[PDB]
Design a binder for this molecule. Sequence first.
Ligand SMILES: NC(=O)c1ccc[n+]([C@@H]2O[C@H](COP(=O)([O-])OP(=O)(O)OC[C@H]3O[C@@H](n4cnc5c(N)ncnc54)[C@H](O)[C@@H]3O)[C@@H](O)[C@H]2O)c1
Ligand SMILES: NC(=O)c1ccc[n+]([C@@H]2O[C@H](COP(=O)([O-])OP(=O)(O)OC[C@H]3O[C@@H](n4cnc5c(N)ncnc54)[C@H](O)[C@@H]3O)[C@@H](O)[C@H]2O)c1
Ligand SMILES: NC(=O)c1ccc[n+]([C@@H]2O[C@H](COP(=O)([O-])OP(=O)(O)OC[C@H]3O[C@@H](n4cnc5c(N)ncnc54)[C@H](O)[C@@H]3O)[C@@H](O)[C@H]2O)c1
Lengths: 514, 514, 514
Amino acid sequence: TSVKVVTDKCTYKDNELLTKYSYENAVVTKTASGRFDVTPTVQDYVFKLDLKKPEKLGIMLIGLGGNNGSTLVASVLANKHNVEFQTKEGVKQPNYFGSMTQCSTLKLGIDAEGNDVYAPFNSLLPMVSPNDFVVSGWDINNADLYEAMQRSQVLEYDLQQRLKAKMSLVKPLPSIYYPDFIAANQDERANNCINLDEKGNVTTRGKWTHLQRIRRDIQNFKEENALDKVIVLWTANTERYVEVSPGVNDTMENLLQSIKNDHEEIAPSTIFAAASILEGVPYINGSPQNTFVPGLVQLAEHEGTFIAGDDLKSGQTKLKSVLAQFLVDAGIKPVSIASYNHLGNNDGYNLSAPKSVIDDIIASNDILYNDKLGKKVDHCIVIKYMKPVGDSKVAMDEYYSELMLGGHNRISIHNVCEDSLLATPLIIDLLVMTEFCTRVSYKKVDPVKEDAGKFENFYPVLTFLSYWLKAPLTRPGFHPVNGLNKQRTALENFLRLLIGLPSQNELRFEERLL
Amino acid sequence: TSVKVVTDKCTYKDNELLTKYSYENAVVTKTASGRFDVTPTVQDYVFKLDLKKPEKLGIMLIGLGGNNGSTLVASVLANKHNVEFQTKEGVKQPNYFGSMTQCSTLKLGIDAEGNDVYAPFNSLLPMVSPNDFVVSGWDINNADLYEAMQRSQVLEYDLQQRLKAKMSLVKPLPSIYYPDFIAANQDERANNCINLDEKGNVTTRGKWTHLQRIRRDIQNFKEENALDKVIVLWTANTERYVEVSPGVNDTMENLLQSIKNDHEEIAPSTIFAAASILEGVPYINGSPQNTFVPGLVQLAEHEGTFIAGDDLKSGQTKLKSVLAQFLVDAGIKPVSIASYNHLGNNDGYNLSAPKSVIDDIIASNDILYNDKLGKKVDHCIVIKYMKPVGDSKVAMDEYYSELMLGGHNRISIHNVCEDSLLATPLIIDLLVMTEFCTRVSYKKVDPVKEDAGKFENFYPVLTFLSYWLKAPLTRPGFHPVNGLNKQRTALENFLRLLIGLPSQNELRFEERLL
Amino acid sequence: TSVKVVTDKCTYKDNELLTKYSYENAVVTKTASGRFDVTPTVQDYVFKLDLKKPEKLGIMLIGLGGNNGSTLVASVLANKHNVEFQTKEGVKQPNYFGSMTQCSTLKLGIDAEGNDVYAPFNSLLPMVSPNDFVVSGWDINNADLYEAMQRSQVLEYDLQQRLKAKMSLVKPLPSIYYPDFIAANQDERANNCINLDEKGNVTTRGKWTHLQRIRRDIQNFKEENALDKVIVLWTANTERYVEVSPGVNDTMENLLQSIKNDHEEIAPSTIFAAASILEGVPYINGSPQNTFVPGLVQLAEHEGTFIAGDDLKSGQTKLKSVLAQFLVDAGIKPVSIASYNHLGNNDGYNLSAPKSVIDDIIASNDILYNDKLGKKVDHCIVIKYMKPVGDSKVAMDEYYSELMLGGHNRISIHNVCEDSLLATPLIIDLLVMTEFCTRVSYKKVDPVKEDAGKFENFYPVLTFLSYWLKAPLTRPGFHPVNGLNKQRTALENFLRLLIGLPSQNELRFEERLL
Ligand SMILES: NC(=O)c1ccc[n+]([C@@H]2O[C@H](COP(=O)([O-])OP(=O)(O)OC[C@H]3O[C@@H](n4cnc5c(N)ncnc54)[C@H](O)[C@@H]3O)[C@@H](O)[C@H]2O)c1
Ligand SMILES: NC(=O)c1ccc[n+]([C@@H]2O[C@H](COP(=O)([O-])OP(=O)(O)OC[C@H]3O[C@@H](n4cnc5c(N)ncnc54)[C@H](O)[C@@H]3O)[C@@H](O)[C@H]2O)c1
Ligand SMILES: NC(=O)c1ccc[n+]([C@@H]2O[C@H](COP(=O)([O-])OP(=O)(O)OC[C@H]3O[C@@H](n4cnc5c(N)ncnc54)[C@H](O)[C@@H]3O)[C@@H](O)[C@H]2O)c1
C-alpha cells in the first residue's frame, strides 16, 4: 500500500524526495484599545526526504527487563512471526493495536461521490516497520526477557509460552546504577551493573568510564547485527530531578568535565543520553526526568544528534487533554478537575517510596477565565500503589464545570486497562517517527537568490513527538503545545505537505457551495 | 474587541466585504494494487460579507413555552438587563457559558515572543448578539413564559422571581396541533391551537389555512417589532417520522397540494417549515423528525431560503463523537459502545410513548475494521424516563475496546447536568451562525471569463451548522460528516478565510525548524 | 402513635417501666483439632425506664457557627415552625430525612395474613423530639447563625431567607481558643474567645478560669431557660491528638491539677469535656480527637456523667462498611479497597495544612484470609480540598474482590451529596439517643437472692451510639464493634427487649413450617 500525489512540487533524484512548501502563518499584536492586528507571514521551504529506510532498525531500550521493555520485544516477535496465541475467547492474532503509526489512518481527499477517503498513516511515505526492529538494551537486572515477562504479568500465559524459547535468549546488558537517584529499595534488583569497585559493590565512581562503556555497547550492538541505524529509548524507573548548577551541567565542556569528576549532578540517564549523542544516536527520554539539562541540549545541537522526551504520556493523560479542551472549546468553563489514579506494577511501586495542559487552556480563553470571573482551575493528581491490582491500571477523573446561569456539569471518567499494553504501542510510535524524522532535511528558500543555501536537519529537539510526550521539550523561548488533537494534526499536515498536499480545511465547498 | 488583518485578498466597499480565496482539495482513486492516486484540485472563489448586521434579530421558536424555549428567553433577558441572582453559593452574574459562539475562542496567530494568540470566536467578523434577540413563537399550551419556567424547573428560583415581571408578559402564539403526529395525546395541555372546527374542536382539516395563519404570524411579528431578519427554530415535542411517497410529499408542487388536500403525510412541522420558507425566513429543525422531506427541500431551493437541522446535538452525544474519534485516531479499536440516558422533562414523557458517528469512524480505518478482524461495533442507546430527576439528565456511556495482544480497555463516562442549560446555549449558536450565513454570498471564479455570473447564497441546506445538529441533513448523494472536531475546524477556517487567513496547520515551523 | 405490648415481663408503675430480660450468649474456646467448644450463657436483668421525657431538651454545640451547627439549628426551626420553602422544584416541606431515629422504622411482628408490620423507630418508647431542642453553644467566631448559613452554603437560598429573622437572633458564646491545637491557623476567623489576658490577647494561661467560665455558660443556659436536662456535643474543627503522659493525663486528680497548671496537654476540648462532666451534663465528641483521655474518663466515672463519641461517622464510611461486610458475607474476598474523597467546606482547611472496620472483617474469616491464601487487604483513604464544590462532597470507592478459578470482581462506587445534610441528621440521632440512655437504669438479677442489688446506669461510655461514631471508644479491655448492620440490630433489640419483645429472628416458622 502506497500513495502517489500528482503535484509539480515533488521531484526525485538519487533515491530522494524534494518538495516545495509555502509555510503560511501570522504575527499578532493586541492593542490596548481592544483590537487585534494580524499580519500574515509566508516562508517558502524545500524539504528533502531520504527515501531509503533501514532494512532493519536498531533499538536499545534502557530498562529492557521492565514491563514496557519485555512487552515491546514480545510484540515485535509475535507480530514478525505471526505467533498466534490461545485465549479465553479463542485463538487471537497478533497486532499493534494502540499504535497510531501502525493502526491509524489519514484523510487524503474525496472520491467520486465526494466521500472522504482514508489511507494508513504509514502509507504516505516509507517508514520503518516495528517488525524490523532489532531490540536490545540495558537493565540493572539480569533476568532474561522471558523471566522479565513473567514478573510483569502483562501478556497472556499462552502467548508467553509460545514466545518463551525466543524470549529466554534475550538478556539485557549490564547498566549504570546510582542509588541516590531512585527508590532506596533497588539494592535487590540491582545485580546487573557495570559500575562496580574492585570487590564488587555498586559505586558512583568512574562515571566517565561508564559513559565509555555505554558508547562501546552501542557500537558492539550495531556491529554484531549488520545495522547502520540505532535508537536509544529510556524506559527505566524514574530518577529524581537534578539541580541545574552553573559551572557544572550548564554548558558542553562543563558537563563532560563534571562526568569525568563524577559530579553528583550527573545521573545515569545523563550518561546514557550523552553516550548516545556522542555516537550520533538519537536519544529519547520516556521518563519524568530533567535529563536533558542545558548542557546535554547544547551537546546535541553541536553533534547534530536528535533528542526527544520527558514522560511517555499515559493514555489517561491523553483523555484529560481532550476532555478539557472539548469543554473549553464549547464555551464550558471547568472549575475543578480531580484525577485519582492507582496501579500495582513495579512502576507504581518505585513512585510510592518512603525516603501544564490545563494552564494553556486557561490562557487561551480570557472570556471564561479572567480576574473578574476567576482565572483559576482546581486540579489534583493522585497516584496510589495497589499491588493486588497488577499491571491493570485504574484511572478516575472528575470534571466539575460551570454552566450557564448558575448551572453545573459533572463528568466522571473511569478508565481501566493493562497500563503496559498502552505504553508499549506508544513507544513503537516514537521509535517509528524518530527514525523517519532522521531521514528529513529542510532548506529555507528565499525569493531573491536561486539555490541559495544547503539542506539542514530538524532542530535537535524533535518537538514533532510531543504527541507521545507528557512534558514536550521545547527550545529556549517557545512555549510547549499540549493540545493533543492539534499535535495529531501537525503530523498529518507534515506528512501531507511532504507529498505535495495542503493542510486539511474541512471546508467541503463541494457540498456547502455550488 | 475587533480584529484587523493586513491582506490584499480583502477589499471593503459599500459596507460590504469582498475576499478572494483559493480552495484546495483532492480527488482520490483506489487501485487494485492497494494504491491511492491523489489528484489535487484548486478552485478560486470570491466571498461577499454583508457587514451590516441586524440591530435586532427576530427569533420565533415553535414550542416557545417549553424548557429550551423558556430558558432561552430567560438567558436573553438576564444577560441583556444584567439580572444578577441569588443562589446557595451567593450572588451570581448571568452569562452565556456553554455557547461556543459567545464564550469560545480561536487562534489568530503567534505574538512576538512566539506564543499563541486567541480571540473570541465572534470577534473576527460582526455577528448578532443573543442580547439583541427578539423572541416569540408558538406552542400548543397557553401558559406564559413565567409559568413555563416554574414547571420546567431549570433555573434558580430567585432568578425566576426576578424575571417573573417580564417573563409573565411573554405568551406563545397558538400553534398547529395534529394529535396524530404526537405519540402521547395532549388535548388538555393543548389549549392553544389554531386548527379548530366550528364546534371548537381540534381537526386535521384545512391545513392550508393553517399554513397561511402561520405566514400571517411571521408577518405580524416582523412588523410589530420593526424587524427585518427573522429566524424560526423548532423546539417542540418530537413528531413521528412521516412517510415519503411519489406525487405526495416528494416534489415541491406535490407537497403544496398535499397540504391543500389535508394529506395524512403533512405534519404541523412540515407546515411551519413551508410557511417559513414561503416568507424567505430560514427554518431549523431541533427535533429528530424527517420534516425536511424532498418536497420542502426543493421548495426551499426555489425560494432561496435557508434550511437545516434535524435533532439538536446533546452534550453527551458530543462526548461520544469526541471519545470515539479519540480512540480510533490513537489506533485503538473500540468494539462495544453502550449509552444509557434518562431525564424527566415534559419531552421525556413524549419519548416514553413508542409508535451515525460510529459508522463514519469504522469506514475511515479499514486496518482495525475489515473482513478479517471485525467490521462491526455493537452500539445501543437506551433513554428511559425518570420524572423524579427534573431537568437534570443522567447519561452513562461504556466504551469497550480491544488493545494490543488480546488486551482490553474499558472506559466509563458519567455525565450529569441540567440538559436545558446545555441545549439553550447551543440553540443560541445555531441562530447566531444562521443569520451570519444569511449575510454571506460567494462567486465561483472562472479562469476564462471574469465576472462570470454573480454572487450566490449558500446551498439551502446549511451543513455548516451540523456541529450543533445530531442528524445533519445533506445534499442527495453526499455523505454526512459527524466528526465534531472536523465540524468545529470547518467553522474556523471559514471565518479565517473571510478575513484573509489560511487554514490552521499547527506546523509551528518557527520552533521545529530553523 | 404508641405501642402497647401484652406481657408479664413489663410492669408500669409510678410513671416508670420495669422490664425483665434474660441475656443469652456463649463463650467459646478453640481446640488443637480445630474443634470449637461453645458454652451457652444466661443472665437475668431488670431494666427501669424513666418514662418522663424532658418537655424541652437542651443542646449546646461547640462550633455552633459551623456547617453542621448552623444546619442543625435551622432544621429544628424549619420542622418546629413548619417553615415550607420555595425551590427550583416547587414548594417543599421540612423534614428530618437522614435521621434513622426520626425517619426509620422497625418490625414489630406479623399480622392476620402474616405480613410484616413496621412502626417508627421512635414510637416504641418515649423519646425526645428534635423539634423540642433548645440550641445554643460556643464558637471562636461571633457570626450569628443567619450569617453562618450564608457562609456554609448548605441550605436553599429561599429557606435561609425565611429563617433569617429567627436565625439572626442566635449567636454563639465565646469559646476557648488554643491556636497550637488546630492544624490551620485561625487568628482572623477567631474573634469570640474567652482566653484573653488582661491586655486583651489570646493566651493559653489561666485554663482553670476558662473551665470555670464554661461551667457558668452551662449553668446560665440551664437557668436562662426552664431546662433541667442538657447535652453537649463537640462539632468544632479537629484538634491535634494530645499525647498521654503518666503525670498529667493518666488520672482524674492529675488532669484537674494539670488544668490548673495550664499544662500544654490540656486542649480546649479537654476543658469543655471536664466542664460538661463536672456539671453532670453528658459530653459527645463528634470529631477525631483523643479528647476522652484516661483522666477525663475516670472523672466521668466518679461524677457518674455520661460521655461518648470520637469522630462522627460519615455516610461515606457507613457505605464502605456495608459493602465490605456484604462481600465477605457472600464468600467473596475483597483484596483491594481504594477510597478518594474531596470537598470544599471550611473544615477543608483544617484537613489541609503543615501539621479499622476492614481488619475486623479479615479476622472474622480465616477461610478467605489466612497465611496460606493471604491475610492482607490493601486499603487507603485519600481526602482532598476542592473549594469549587461548596458543601457538596464527592466520594469514590473502588472494591477489587477475588472470585473463584482466577476470577475477579470490580465494584466502583460514586457518592455525591451535601456533606452537612447527612451529618446534621446524624447529630440529631446522637442527641436523641444519648438523652434516652440517660433515662435507662438496669439491675442484675441474682437467682439466689431476691431484690439483690440496686439499679445502676449505663457505663459512663455509651456504646449503643457506635452506629454514629467512627472511632467508638470502648472500655479498657473490650474491642470496638464496627459492623454497621450489627450496631443497628443492637439498637433494635435493646428497644424491643425494653417493651418485652424477643430478639429478631427472621425464622418464619409460621410459613416455613406447619
Ligand atoms: N506503563 C505506562 O503506561 C507509562 C506511562 C507514562 C510513563 N511511563 C514511564 O515509563 C517508565 C517505565 O515504566 P514500567 O511500567 O515499564 O516500569 P518497570 O518497573 O516495569 O520497568 C523499569 C525497569 O527499569 C529498570 N531500571 C531501573 N533503574 C535502571 C537503570 N539505572 N539502568 C537500567 N535499567 C534500570 C528496572 O530494573 C526495571 O526493569 C517509567 O519511567 C514510567 O514513569 C510508563
Ligand atoms: N431540553 C434539552 O436539553 C434538549 C437537548 C437535545 C434535544 N432536545 C429536543 O428538543 C425537543 C423539545 O425540547 P424541550 O426541552 O423544549 O421539550 P419540552 O417538553 O420541555 O417543551 C416542548 C414544548 O413544545 C410544546 N409543543 C408540543 N407540541 C407542539 C406543537 N405541535 N407546536 C408547538 N408547540 C408544541 C409543548 O407543550 C412544550 O411547551 C425534543 O425533540 C428533544 O429531543 C432537547
Ligand atoms: N460536617 C461533616 O459532615 C462531618 C463528618 C464527620 C466528622 N466531622 C467533624 O466535625 C467537625 C465540624 O466540621 P464542619 O464541616 O461542621 O466544619 P465547620 O468549619 O463548618 O465548623 C466548625 C466550627 O467550629 C468552630 N471552632 C473551631 N475551633 C473551635 C474551638 N476551639 N472552640 C469553639 N468553636 C471552634 C469554627 O469556627 C467553625 O464555625 C470536624 O472537625 C470533623 O472532625 C464533620
